[PDB]
Structures are given as structure tokens and as C-alpha cells.
Amino acid sequence: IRQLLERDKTPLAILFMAAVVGTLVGLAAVAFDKGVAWLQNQRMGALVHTADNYPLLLTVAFLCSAVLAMFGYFLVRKYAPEAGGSGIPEIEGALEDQRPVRWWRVLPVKFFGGLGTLGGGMVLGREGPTVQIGGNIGRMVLDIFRLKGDEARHTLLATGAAAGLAAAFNAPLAGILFIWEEMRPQFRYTLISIKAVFIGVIMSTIMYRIFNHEVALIDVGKLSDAPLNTLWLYLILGIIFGIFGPIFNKWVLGMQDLLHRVHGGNITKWVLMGGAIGGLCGLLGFVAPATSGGGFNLIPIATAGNFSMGMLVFIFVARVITTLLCFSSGAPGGIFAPMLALGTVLGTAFGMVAVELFPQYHLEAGTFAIAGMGALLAASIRAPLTGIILVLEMTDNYQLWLPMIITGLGATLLAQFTGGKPLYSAILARTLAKQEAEQ
Ligand SMILES: [Cl-]
């Protein structure tokens, strides 16, 4: 039993409080999806009404995406600037007791704002929203029960975060790990109940399962094992990911600055630029579907081997551009799921080349797709084990655990020894830097 491995006392009331967080964050995530689904579906509704007139069809594809995104960007800047971006480094800073948790503002704004952006088909994941909404719900039940002390504050906050990520990806184990590998700080120690995190996670996960009729987010089928002879090829894949991750990080950070210059703070300009980017991804959604959107659409396609090498390269470059654009603009939305799609494409690409260059081996291109899927998470987020267990939980391919660990180990060691840093930490340090420039 895993239950025996964690017989460490935490107050019971707090545990009960965690199940409340879990259930609420569960419902939150679920309702969020249905909002996103509904909007993407209303958007298609217009595109069918105008299948007659082509230029108008594009112009509506642009405007509906623009008007939705503009709504998002506005809420954030009018009512809750910290709801911009992922909001994972906010929750990280809150766990450092260095950032507030203004749930009364962040709750409606992150929810409807992401509903805007993700409803528009912007290249943004639901992770940022569900973790930040989650953590903030944690703080919310804490404040309602007027609960006391660091242990309650940190535990319920991390429960909200863990359950949030669990619910995004029907992946309970990822949720737990993600707290202990990335979200908590070290050398500035904290008090987090494993049992509570487990409990919240378990409760949000079943929420997903109840409202999502027995379906995988990613159906990749079953794929072949990885021969021993092959194992070294996964280390080369990883080394590539270890060089690219830190470069992407700089690109992510640099693009936050570069885009800031366009509006220089101004709400109207910011919303307008946001609307441009908003609208653009809705256009791209119709004309080149794999360059825009979330990324779950193309992952099963690319894994089966249904794209071509030339097409893979097109998608990679195009998605790097639209991810850096949608996210660094500071819309409510995550970079996490975008990193899964980019990793899968890069991984699949590596497959195709490996298959031909080594015809003696017995290679499936799709097994390099899966090992890459979590390898940008190892190289940029610098949370390898989460990526791995996440990918393992979402794809169900448990036979690939060793090639995947080799890819991740390679990614992180190369990411460290080229002087990159955790993307969420770098974003937070930048936030704390601005806050410590007015003191
Ligand atoms: Cl994110």
C-alpha cells in the first residue's frame, strides 16, 4: 500500500478542507472545458453559415477569434494583471510567501479570460488557467474557514494547484509530482501535506472522469517496445531537447519584452495587439489547423506517422512562432500543453530520420514521438519526472518508461550545462525583480 508510505500527521480538518478544494477545482476545470468547447463550437457555427462566401468566411474566422481574445486580454488588464500568462509562477511565488492570491479578482478573470483566449483557438493550454484557478480556490476555502498558520496556507494552496493540473490532464500522479518537483521552493522551506495533495488530486480527477465519458484526451493506441540496442538513440533525442529548451526560454522571455514595446503598457493598444494575435490564430485555425489551436489535435496524427517530414518541419516552425506569440503577449493561457505538441513534433521528426538512417534496428517513429512529448517539459520547465509520468499517464504506453527517462535525463543535463533555468522560476524572478525595483 502507498497509504503506509505516508503515515505522517497533519490536522484532519485540513484534510477535509483539501477534499473541498479538490471537488471545487474539479468542477471548475470541467466547467472551463465546456466553456471552451462551447465557444469553439459556436465559432464553427458562423463558419458554416458563411461557407458560401470565402473571403467573409476568413474575415469571420478572424473577427470572432479577435473579439473573443480582446475580451480576455481586457479582463486581465482591467481587473487582474497577474491572471495574464500561465499564472503558474504566481502560485509558485505564493508558495514562497512572496506573491498575493487575490482570488476575488483572479477567479472570475482567469476563468472568463481564458474562456475568451482558449475559446478563440489561441495556442494556449488549459494548465495555466486550471492551476492558477485551482491554487486561488485553495486560498479561497482557506479564507472562508478563517484558517490559521503556514501549514493550512501552503497545503491548501498546493492542493489547489496539484488538483488543477490533475484535472487538466486526467493525470493524478502528474499533479502530485508537479508540486514536489517544480512548485515548492527549497532552502526557503515550506509545509505541504502529501495526504492533502493526494486527496485533492483524487477528488478533481474523478470530477473529470464523471463529466468526460470514458475518453482519453490522447488516443495513441498501443505501440511497440524499445529494444536495448535502441536505448542510446533516446539519449541523442534528449541532448537535442537539452540544447533547444534553454534557447526557447530566452525566446519566450525576449518575446515578452519585444511585445511589451508595441503597447508599452497601454490597455487599448495591449487589447488591440491581443486581438490581432487573437484573430490571426482563428484565421490560421481554418487555413492551417495544425499551426494554431491547442495541440491535442495533431499529437495523435503525428504519432501514427500521418504527417510527412517536410510537413513536420513546417508545423514545428509555425507553432514555435504562434506559441511565442500567443503566450508571451500575456493572454490567460498556458505554455505547458503547447510544449507537449512541440515536443511530439520534434520527437516524431527524430523518429523518421532514425528509421531510415538505421534500417537494422526495428524502430517505430511513434516511440520517438512519445519520448519527445515530455522532453521540452524536461528542458524548459525543468520538471522531467512530471513530464515523463504525465506522458505515461496520458498515452498509457507504460512499456516506454526507460527510453523516456533516458530522453529526459539527457534533456535536463544538457539544459543545465548550457546555463538555462526553469522557465517558471525565470518568469517569477523577473516578477519579483520589478516588485523589488519599487523598493
Ligand atoms: Cl503554463
Distance CA 354, CA 405 (A): 19
The Å distance, Cα 50 to ligand 1 centre, comes to 35
Number of H helices, E strands in the chain: 18, 0
Tell me the three state secondary structure of residue 220: coil
Phi, psi of 387 (to 5 degrees): -45, -60
CA angle 418, 422, 423 (to 5 degrees): 110
Helix (H) or strand (E) holding 319: helix 309-328
Binding residues for chloride, by number, are 86, 335-336, 424
User: Grid coordinates in use for 70?
Assistant: 480582446
Give whole-number Cα distances, 214 to 125, 170, 219, 358, 393, in Å. Answer: 21, 11, 12, 39, 15
Work out the angle between the directed axes of helices 267-287 and 231-263 (0-180°, nearest 10).
140
Residues contacting 139, CB < 8 A, separation 6+: 94, 101, 103, 153, 156, 157, 160
The Å distance, Cα 240 to ligand 1 centre, comes to 22
Q: How many residues are present in the chain?
A: 439
- The DSSP-derived string for 77-122 is HHH-GGGSB--HHHHHHHHTT-S---HHHHHHHHHHHHHHHHHTT-
User: Grid coordinates in use for 34?
Assistant: 465546456
The Å distance, Cα 181 to ligand 1 centre, comes to 15
The Å distance, Cα 341 to ligand 1 centre, comes to 13
Nearest to 377 by CA among 211, 85, 178, 224: 178
Contact present, 275 and 71 (Cβ < 8 Å): no
The Å distance, Cα 183 to ligand 1 centre, comes to 12
The Å distance, Cα 269 to ligand 1 centre, comes to 24
Torsion (CA) 341, 384, 412, 326 in degrees, nearest 10 = 30
Helix (H) or strand (E) holding 66: helix 54-79
Distance CA 209, CA 212 (A): 5
Binding residues, by number, are 86, 335-336, 424
Distance CA 118, CA 324 (A): 15
> CA quadruple 260, 262, 268, 270: dihedral positive or negative?
negative
Distance CA 26, CA 21 (A): 8
Tell me the three state secondary structure of residue 222: coil
> CA quadruple 92, 96, 100, 102: dihedral positive or negative?
positive
Which structural technique was applied? Answer: X-ray
Nearest to 59 by CA among 46, 72, 73, 69: 46
The Å distance, Cα 362 to ligand 1 centre, comes to 36
Distance CA 65, CA 118 (A): 9
- The DSSP-derived string for 398-409 is GGGHHHHHHHHH
Distance CA 133, CA 161 (A): 8
Instruction: Cite the beta strand spans of 141-260 per DSSP E.
Output: none
Nearest to 180 by CA among 205, 153, 154: 154
Residues contacting 4, CB < 8 A, separation 6+: none
Contact present, 138 and 86 (Cβ < 8 Å): no
The Å distance, Cα 294 to ligand 1 centre, comes to 12
- Taking residue 303's Cβ as centre, other Cβ atoms within 10 Å add up to 28
Distance CA 242, CA 407 (A): 9
The Å distance, Cα 405 to ligand 1 centre, comes to 22
Distance CA 268, CA 266 (A): 6
- Taking residue 350's Cβ as centre, other Cβ atoms within 10 Å add up to 24
Distance CA 353, CA 372 (A): 14
Classify residue 5 by its DSSP letter: G
Resolution rounded to one decimal, in angstroms: 3.1
10 Å CB burial of residue 174 (0-12, 13-18, 19+) is: buried
The Å distance, Cα 324 to ligand 1 centre, comes to 12
CA angle 318, 72, 57 (to 5 degrees): 55
Contact present, 386 and 376 (Cβ < 8 Å): no
Contact present, 315 and 346 (Cβ < 8 Å): no
User: Grid coordinates in use for 51?
Assistant: 461557407
The domains of the chain are located at 1-439
The Å distance, Cα 33 to ligand 1 centre, comes to 16
Superfamily of domain 1-439: Clc chloride channel (1.10.3080.10)
The Å distance, Cα 425 to ligand 1 centre, comes to 12
